[PDB]
Amino acid sequence: MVLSEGEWQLVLHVWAKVEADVAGHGQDILIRLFKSHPETLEKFDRFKHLKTEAEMKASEDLKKHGVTVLTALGAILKKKGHHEAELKPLAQSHKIPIKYLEFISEAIIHVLHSRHPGDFGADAQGAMNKALELFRKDIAAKYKELGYQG
Template sequence: MCSVQYLESPEERTGAERPCQDLPVFLPPAAPFVASISSTMSFSEAEVQSARGAWEKMYVDAEDNGTAVLVRMFTEHPDTKSYFTHFKGMDSAEEMKQSDQVRGHGKKVFTAINDMVQHLDNSEAFLGIVNPLGKKHATQLKIDPKNFRIICDIILQLMEEKFGGDCKASFEKVTNEICTHLNNVYKEEGW
């Protein structure tokens, strides 16, 4: 499991130890991009516990489940592969499943979601994870925001297939919150 290091300001990111490979997480008390995106998150304690329980079932096998999600996304939505230059040459699902790069990125996606899930009851911390992730994907990686809905829908499909409709229902609000907040970041970045 990835530990998250919270940094005080963007300046502290330079040279700082970076948890979760290149997913820096910082919670500045008044960072403009955090403060300007208001949180509409409202999870009851029961919803938080239910969502965490559902996610725990998926996250216990983060690498395999993350890989399955990416392989399905690349297979069902081949245009999504165009953002990953090192995945472009992989045409078969089996080849993708065996790729260390695909497996590593699948785990990275699941680790980021896990960090968000751990903060469903703390909107400031949740946004401290979502906002830098959204900003990086919008400004540096230029990923179309519709791809977040695609990957979240595939996660929900896989949850339902593996653990049933109740598991999916418990996590659906989380994916909606993630996509909503990522879309808000994109709007702020001019998309």
């Protein structure tokens, strides 16, 4: 998987907008994820009490974790694929199956298009899709290395 430097610039430009409201984006993303895939809620001790969108919006656990997710992902995306030093320990900490990373990728794309439609057209969406795909493949490689079949 390869992005052009132009595509990386699209990803970083929209990421700059994410960074103006990390917590709000994080909430929107996790809420979208949990509404699309409610079956995942039960897997997280810190989230399994959340049943409804109202409970999700009011949750400090969800807000704080949204910030964690986007901070980790932001640092990775800014490496423009040269993210081994960031990705190795992150893979370490995980479990989170690969399909959950797919779910969250989909929620990221949806939210960024919803919040920043001018700066997140077809080209930027494609670039972000590739960037998140590269991330998932590389983390999958780190998983399989330690035998977590992800």
